[PDB]
Amino acid sequence: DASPIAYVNLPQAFVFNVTGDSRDRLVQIKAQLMVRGAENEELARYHSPLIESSLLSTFASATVDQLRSPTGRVELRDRASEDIKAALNAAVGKPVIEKVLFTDFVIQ
Amino acid sequence: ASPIAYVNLPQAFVFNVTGDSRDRLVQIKAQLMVRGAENEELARYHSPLIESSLLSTFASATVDQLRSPTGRVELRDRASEDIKAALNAAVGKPVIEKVLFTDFVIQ
Amino acid sequence: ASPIAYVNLPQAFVFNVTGDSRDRLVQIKAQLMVRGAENEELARYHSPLIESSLLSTFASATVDQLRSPTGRVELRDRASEDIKAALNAAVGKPVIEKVLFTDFVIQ
Amino acid sequence: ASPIAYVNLPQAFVFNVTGDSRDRLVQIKAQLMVRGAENEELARYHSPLIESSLLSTFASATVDQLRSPTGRVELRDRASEDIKAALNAAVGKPVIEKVLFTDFVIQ
Amino acid sequence: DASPIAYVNLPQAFVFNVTGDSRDRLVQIKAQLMVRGAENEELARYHSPLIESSLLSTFASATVDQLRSPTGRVELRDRASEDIKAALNAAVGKPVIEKVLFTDFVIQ
Amino acid sequence: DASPIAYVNLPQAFVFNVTGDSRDRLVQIKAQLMVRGAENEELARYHSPLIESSLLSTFASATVDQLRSPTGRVELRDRASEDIKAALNAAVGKPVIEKVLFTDFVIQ
Amino acid sequence: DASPIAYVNLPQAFVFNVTGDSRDRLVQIKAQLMVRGAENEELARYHSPLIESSLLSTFASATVDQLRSPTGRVELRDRASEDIKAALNAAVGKPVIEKVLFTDFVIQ
Amino acid sequence: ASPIAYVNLPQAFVFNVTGDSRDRLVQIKAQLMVRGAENEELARYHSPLIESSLLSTFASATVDQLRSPTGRVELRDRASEDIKAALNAAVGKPVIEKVLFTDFVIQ
Amino acid sequence: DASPIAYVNLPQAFVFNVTGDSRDRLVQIKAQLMVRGAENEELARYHSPLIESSLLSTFASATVDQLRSPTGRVELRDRASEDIKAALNAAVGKPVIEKVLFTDFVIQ
Amino acid sequence: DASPIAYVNLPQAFVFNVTGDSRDRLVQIKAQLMVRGAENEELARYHSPLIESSLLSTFASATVDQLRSPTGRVELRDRASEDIKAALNAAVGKPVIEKVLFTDFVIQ
Amino acid sequence: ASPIAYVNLPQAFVFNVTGDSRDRLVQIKAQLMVRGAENEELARYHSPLIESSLLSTFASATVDQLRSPTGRVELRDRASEDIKAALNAAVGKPVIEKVLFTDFVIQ
Amino acid sequence: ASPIAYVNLPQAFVFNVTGDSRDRLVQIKAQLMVRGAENEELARYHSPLIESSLLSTFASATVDQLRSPTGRVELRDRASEDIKAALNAAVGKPVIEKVLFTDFVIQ
Amino acid sequence: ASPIAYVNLPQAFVFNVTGDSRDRLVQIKAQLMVRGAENEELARYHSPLIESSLLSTFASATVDQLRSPTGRVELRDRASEDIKAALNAAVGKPVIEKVLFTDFVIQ
Amino acid sequence: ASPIAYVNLPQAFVFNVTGDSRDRLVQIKAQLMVRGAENEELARYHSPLIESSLLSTFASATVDQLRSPTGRVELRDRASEDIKAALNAAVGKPVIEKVLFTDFVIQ
Amino acid sequence: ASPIAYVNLPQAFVFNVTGDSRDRLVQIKAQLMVRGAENEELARYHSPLIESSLLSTFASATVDQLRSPTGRVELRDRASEDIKAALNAAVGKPVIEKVLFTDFVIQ
Amino acid sequence: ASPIAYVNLPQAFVFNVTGDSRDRLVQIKAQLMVRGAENEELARYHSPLIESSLLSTFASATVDQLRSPTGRVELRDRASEDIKAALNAAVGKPVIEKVLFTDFVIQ
Amino acid sequence: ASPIAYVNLPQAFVFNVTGDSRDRLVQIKAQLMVRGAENEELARYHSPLIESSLLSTFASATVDQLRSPTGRVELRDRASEDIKAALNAAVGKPVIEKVLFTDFVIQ
Amino acid sequence: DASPIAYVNLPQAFVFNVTGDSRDRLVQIKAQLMVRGAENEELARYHSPLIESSLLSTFASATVDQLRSPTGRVELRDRASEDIKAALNAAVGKPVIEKVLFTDFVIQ
Amino acid sequence: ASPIAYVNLPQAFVFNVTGDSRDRLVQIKAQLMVRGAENEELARYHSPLIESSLLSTFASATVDQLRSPTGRVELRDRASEDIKAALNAAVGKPVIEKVLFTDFVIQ
């Protein structure tokens, strides 16, 4: 009965440009948020516009050398998850989420 | 430090880059982050004016402010201060706290 | 002063510029900024005249004016002063305060 | 005179130019600015005749009357008198006051 | 001519082809009927299938250079009106229409 | 003698391939029947399949020059009327229709 | 009585390829049945799947010579009718249709 | 001399048979002609077995047999005897009399 | 002695690539399960996701030459039906199906 | 006492890239979860976002010779299963699934 | 001779007849039997006149006439004559042949 | 002379007439019979005036007139002359020919 | 002989019968039994005439006949013979074989 | 001499008048009769004021006026002049020509 | 020994039986049990005749049989054997095996 | 401003008043007559407060006032002055000109 | 000088009060009048608590109060100050300014 | 500063009878819950079938004079709250709700 | 222990109990409170057996028990043990933990 895991769905997928090597490509990322506790579930859901901002800002600084690599995608989640906590810690004083989950990842 | 509230701007801003031979379009989906139930009421009512302040900021953005991480973050700080200055002249008070970009593509 | 109100012109304006290089289509979305319930009523009831006035204003602009930041700002001002000068000759009062552009593409 | 009224012609006037080196289509969307409660009634009833007078005006228009800013204004003036002359010869009254162009593109 | 004016709509536009220079075009004309009197308005609707045919037989005998000229267009509209009157006089003995109105005219 | 005119709709659009010379051009013909008399009206409706068959039989001999001259179209339209009669005249003993009308005629 | 005319509709058009052919040309025939009598109409409807089978056989055996000559169609409508009668004569012991009718015919 | 019944197979049989230089696609729409009421009840229940037997028969044919009308006749008889043999080993009864073809295209 | 035959449907159309991609082709298969007894019919429906999995595993080894020869197609049908039995033999302890039936087989 | 089999569907099909050798290739895997027990069935549904994230992190690290060889997917399913069990063990403390099934696999 | 055709009058005729104990509410549903396609056309278009002549006929019926078979055959054969005379004055043709009673309650 | 046309009055007439003891409730469904397309056009357009003349005539009729079929015909011709006299004063034309009763109950 | 066919008469029959202490409603739902494909064609087309010959027959039956089992059997044959005598006068053929009663209530 | 137009008042007027032995529920359905498009435009817009003037005139009449045929005629001429006097103080113009009664029940 | 199959009769049976004080209202919902695929085909096609033989049998039953449990078994068997006699004369075959009662109420 | 506007109150005003014999319902349908576009904006926005001032006024009405034509006029004039008093205390402006009663039934 | 806003409570308050002769069903529909966008937010969120304090006040009132125009005001003020007492204990703010009654009946 | 207030709606009204001195008067109560904290809002919604039971057991024990007296309803309100807290302390271990609210209360 | 779950029973239990003067209805709305994810599946799948065991317990209780607050508590505890006894005999598990009554009227 310790703080139960809950998943806040970010329904709108993230399309963005990768700063690629002379290749104009689009990356589509469908993500969700893993939280623990009820008041974190309603906080991450209520502040989802700010969370959608932290993710899109993180995905821009990601290189195609970092997206194509499996190890880079793992490091991408860590940096994307930490960037949300830094923004929420400054806005509401709480690190609401505990990690962000990628459920779809294509490079079109 | 009133509770935070987010005002949505539904129409995504579709505009073209600053003078490029390969004519590409920019699509930005934005929202407003306000503090206070009164500012939220003001941010919704004057949102047509806020949308114009965002376009005047986007249409004057350089290529660096569209393809660089530091450039995009500056454009966010650029667009926010433009809105505060525009609303400070219309209603006498800066309504928003900052602008939020939830989608940003160049195609 | 009377409270600020906005009148939305829902249909976007598509028009050809008098360009000399190639064929060009420009799409502009606009709303009206008025003050007072009296002018807000007139702005809606005379939207056909206002939609007509904006189209005649845009058609005279060249592409270089659309890319220069001052060209757009002086086009918005020229568009606003034309609607006022047109509604002054139809009802006797400059209904609107200024024209607001919320989206702008050259394609 | 009487308060102004606007009669909408929902038919979009699509026609082709006397193309210099290629075929090209023009799309015109027009309304009717009339003064009076009886003129508004007359303009809406005889809108087929009014729509016919506009097609005859557009089909006889040069390319200068279509792509020039001054000539496009001339096309509006000539189109108004064609309707006045038609309705005066049909009902005895020049029902409309002037024709308004809400959309004017050349694909 | 003393009766009030009425307008009978022909809702289906007229698609036909005319002999071009060497390639035939495809002309589309949206037309309406102008009548005077409730009796002529009554007949113009009931006999519209015959009126639709008399216009098609008129447009079939048209050429492109006749279409791209003010006189050739006015000649065509006036000829299309007399042909219907001749057709309806032969059927019901009354030229129920005053003239044919052209509301839209494209040629592609 | 002079019965009230009635128009019977043949809803099927006649698409057929004219024996083109330059290329294989299609033909789209939409027809309606002009009859006089209430008995002829329901006879034309009940025998519409037979009347449509008589229209395809006469269109099978149509050449390209047949469908492009206005004199040849009237020549064809008259052959369509007299053939529909002869078919119905030998099937039900009565020439049912008066004329056949063409309300849509394109070639492309 | 007089064995009144009756028409049984075959709603789906017949699409098949001409035999031979330089290429593999497609043709589309929309057919109906013209039966005589109230009992033959019931038989023609209930036995339509077999009647549709008898038409595919007759259709898929026609030459491009036969499908483009206007008299070749006549020799085909009669061949389609005689084949259905022979088929139904062995199925139910009665010739049912007395003829078949074409309402649309294209050679794409 | 039991009553004749027609069991319909809605989904048309789309398959491919290799020619000389073609990835040739064939479409066949078929129905089942049965005799008696018990077989009509059995032909509907055992349709997946019947549809499978038909697909197995068509795949074994060559484009030569699909061209010649005689070859198509011995394709119905080969499809019928295959269906009967398939139902004999499953329910001990040849359920159908003959399989009918209503559509046959090759493009 | 003979249990009643039942047919369990698999509405999923199996789409997969031919393994030999020197000739890059795509094949679509629609299958149905043939079982006996009401208990096996109940089992085949409940374990359909497992049965769908065994078919995909069988379709992975199918060679392009095996998909073309009809003797190889029945070699694949008699193999895919055995793999399903082996799969269900290990999961629930009894071979649920009798054979797999193919109702659509195209190589696009 | 026994734990009957239960299948937990994942309706979202997985779309990703291979890091292809010749060019960028698109893959589509449609998966389902095969659990045992009633508590695990509801655990598999509630933690679907975490499970879908683990399958994506597994499919991304897979190569082309894995996705084109039959046993390469056999190794992929095991790695897909073991990664989910390791993820859920750190999150909820139980290896919920015990295996993952593939019902559709296309590398286009 | 001029094949029989039936023209349906969907309006169920509702009218009152004066009895002795209480007022009687009669309800009649009728049709029209005509011969010839032209008389069938006239019977439909002149239905408001035919419905009028049936009400005038049924309103004069005594309660003893309704509760009597020979009285209803008298009323049935009388309403037909009253329609033939009504249409002879309007179009000069005895359109119908007879009137059919399909339902008859008196309650 | 001219073709007969029937203009239907969809809204039935409900009113009250005083008998001996109670106040009665009458329900009349009426249709107009005209000759000529001109009069059919006027009877439809001037229907509210026609619906007023019928109510002005019905409420002035007694129960002994509504009950007597010989006197009920007098009401039909009385209502017709009242409409003709009314329309002769509004448009100078006796538009209708006669009023028709298609349903008549006396509750 | 000829194939049996049943022609449904969906509009059920509702009529009164003269009792002693009350007028009782009678609701009969009937169908037609025909033999041959042509009689079925006539029974449907001449259905309004057939529905009339039943109302003339049903209304002439006393309560002592409707309650009796034998009374219903003779009424059925009487209603059947009445239709044949009616259709022999109209189209010279006795179309039906016998009338069937599928519902019989007396209230 | 302007063309006649009719303005419909949809919401019926339900009011009370007090007679002997009971109250009275009166229900009047009315339409306006105007001449000219300007009056037609004014009558529709000022209907809430017109509905009030009718209710103010209706609720002030005695039961002997609603029951008398001549009493209703003078009520129309009284209700009409009360509207003209009301609209003379509102917009300085008597808008209507007369009021019409299309349904008049009294319970 | 053919497989069992049930043919439904959806519309229940309503009929009257004579009791001591009143007429008792009986409602019977019934189905048919047949053996064989062909008999099931005839049972549905000859439902109007089977519905006739059932109502003809139910009318011959009294209250002391319906309220008696053993009196309903002989009724179920009488209704069954009476149907077989009706179909032995109609189609030369006894179609059903026996009739089934699923719902049964009185009064 | 000069132009008259009507603000509608769609809620029915149902309330009770104690009479000389029994409690009495009242149903009043009211609308607001304002002058000017700015007043129309306040009247719609402050309808909850205005609806309260009407109920607070109608609650104090006596049965002899609602039935007296002079009383309703005084009540109508008192309900308007009460509304102007409430809006003067809330927004500092007397928004409405008068209150209009379109439907009034006491019962 | 804060803007006024109205928070509606849709579910009308139905409660019972004990009278001299029987119980009386009182039905009150209320709205909330607040000043400030912040107080409008709390009034909506805490409406379940506000609907409770109103019933805790309404159900504790007498019939002599609800029939008194003065006591009805003292109730409206008692309910207004009772809500401030609860919200000053829940969130420490007098969220509302007063309560409004839009309908007040006693059944 | 304890926790933000939240309201959990019990949309099903409570209907029950009480034995009056003359009749069996019917009561109708529509209730809601006031909780503080996001977890208590989550628990009160999930355990609503238990909370609705603790109200019916409490309401059914109340007399008729206890309902008409406003001082008795405040006692019934504060009593129904403690009966829920004791029920949830034994069920889940937390006094989830803070107090019960009454939005509608009639007697018949 | 295992987590708590609630298995709803949508069938409201309607039955009768024998009172001293008449038979009083009883309406009990019940739900199942299970502990364990497996028990939830068993409780849902065995609802027909559970609904059977509840009615066997409800239809056996007396009126003095259903009206007793303490008598209802031991009814809830007895109906709970009745389900556990039945499910232990069928599946060898006491699936439920206790029954919950959500609504309980007797009327």
Residue numbers in the entry:
A (entry chain F), E (entry chain J), F (entry chain A), G (entry chain B), I (entry chain D), J (entry chain E), ...: 60 to 167
B (entry chain G), C (entry chain H), D (entry chain I), H (entry chain C), K (entry chain K), L (entry chain T), ...: 61 to 167
Describing publication, verbatim:
The FliLPeri crystal belongs to the space group of P42212 and contains 20 molecules in an asymmetric unit. Therefore, we determined the structure of FliLPeri with the same region as that of FliLC. FliLPeri forms a head-to-head stack of two decameric rings in the crystal asymmetric unit. FliLPeri forms a ring assembly in the crystal with an inner diameter of around 8 nm, which is comparable to the size of the stator unit. The bean-shaped subunits are vertically arranged in a parallel manner in the ring. The C terminus of each subunit is arranged on the inner surface of the ring on the opposite side of the ring-to-ring interface. The side-by-side subunit interaction in the ring is primarily hydrophobic. The subunit interface is formed by characteristic hydrophobic belts on both sides of the subunit along the longitudinal direction of the molecule.
FliL, a component protein of the flagellar motor, is known to enhance the motor performance under high-load conditions in some bacteria. A flagellar protein, FliL, which is a single-transmembrane protein with a large periplasmic region and associates with the flagellar basal body, has been found to be important for the function of the motor under high-load conditions, such as the highly viscous environments in some species. FliLPeri shows a remarkable structural similarity to the stomatin/prohibitin/flotillin/HflK/C (SPFH) domain of stomatin family proteins, some of which are involved in modulation of ion channel activities in various organisms.
